[PDB]
């Protein structure tokens, strides 16, 4: 027993964290088989910042301009091109640690592991949600550019995150390894502000079946709702609606614990009305939405 | 920007966990140079469990008795030891992964990273603190076993936990590598309780300086305090004593945010005797304790 935000082993992206120079700008890259991925916005300069145009910044690059550094090794760049956001550096060598490995693009209320990294090597490891608005809260200082964020389902590690940039309240917004953006955010430094964010209701509701697998049952009540008035209480408190597929997912969770799901749902309102009242579910004072459905089968069962 | 519950990559221990098999128990070991580190009761059955004699179920076995599996790997045992409550298992390959590694034992309050194993398979990684009543208040299951806790110094890897049991509360008991308990516990099935814990004061007034370098900033106040009338404050609200070593290994955060220790120190003191007031530190509605001064330090700086 025991309730932990928990991470993914990082070693098998540790093998793959490099370094990437271009100019006076170094930032981290993601090394597998023969080629290196990294943020396109390494090749700005200062004055590139607000408007790139990056087919005419890329034209201008020799494979040599770029310096990837793997470990103590030079590795010689021999091929360039750009997918959407993110550069794609062909290397002379496969990286030998080059784990199985999948490409996935994820949905707001997913989690993955963040390895952060600085100068291609990795400082920390730690979990994150992609938040509705399509942001993540992590952890991230200047240099942390091409940290990437994964999940690992069996020996197969799946990258779903790369990170970009800072929004001005603090949060982080990145690409897929495809290099698209979560969000609405583009690789410029114009004035680019999150919506406002929520809570991941799907996940707290997994959440409060945890906390009842561990053996806390004080939340629960006798009530039960429909779905259509959960939705409409919890979008006041800023929740996202739960959809029927939320309520499906949640089914196992359901028939572990005996309590169904608007039976659970129905304990949630009541605890957006009360509060916990100087009580704490699973060590929290608040009620935890970066833990999925998933999540909670794999930690607890 | 940003402050994260955050543990040291863990590849290179992740490189060093097997799984060992004694009868019909399976659990983890540590596999380094040429030795399997792993807790002495695996040896042992149900019956023995209730009352065992180690060294009398130790000599019983031999060394083909303990099935030792790196990935897809049989090891040759070819000795077995006891040192305290670990198993020394001898093994005829040196691990090509050993890290530059050493065993240290931690004080309480002192966090670190635990990788949870199952069957020798890393499953998953996070951050701890030893609690004052020398618990921890981690995640794991059966298999869990075997399961270490570890820090990153700079290329050294200092193992300092092994997961031994579960306490009746659900919080976490072990040893150090070395085999010795952390807290007045033992390895039998008998009734065994934690202490009352406390929190660790240090570590909150860390995490304040981190709220603070990330612009959470409402609970400052223009107050300052003494060490001992503080101490009255943390004895009352079951807060361990804050010492003067405690204030010295602030100063770097006092210096660096301009709030010197004891100016925080009667924020502290204003939160416990008020509570938060609907307003939170960090996302976080209570006060953590499970980041010191150098967690702090090392992760608003990017130490790598
Ligand atoms: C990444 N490691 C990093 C990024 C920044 O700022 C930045 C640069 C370009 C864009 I387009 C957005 C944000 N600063 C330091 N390090
Ligand atoms: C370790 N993987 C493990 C331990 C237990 O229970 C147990 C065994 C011996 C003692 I002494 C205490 C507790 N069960 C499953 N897995
Ligand atoms: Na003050």
New binding site residues.
Partial sequence: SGFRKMAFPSGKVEGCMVQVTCGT?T??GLWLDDVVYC?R?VI?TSED?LN?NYEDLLIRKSNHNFLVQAGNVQLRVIGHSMQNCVLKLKVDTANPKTPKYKFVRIQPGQTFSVLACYNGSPSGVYQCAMRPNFTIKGS????????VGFNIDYDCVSFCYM????LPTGVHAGTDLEGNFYGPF????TAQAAGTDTTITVNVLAWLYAAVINGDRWFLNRFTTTLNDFNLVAMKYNYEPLTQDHVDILGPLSAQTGIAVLDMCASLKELLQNGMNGRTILGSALLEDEFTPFDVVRQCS
């Avoid at 990170?163 to 800072?166: I, L």
């Avoid at 583009?186 to 430094?189: A, G, M």
């Fill in positions: 700008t930032l981290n943020p916005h700005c910042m790139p991230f200082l200047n240099g942390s550019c091409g940290s990170h970009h940039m800072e583009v690789d410029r430094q």
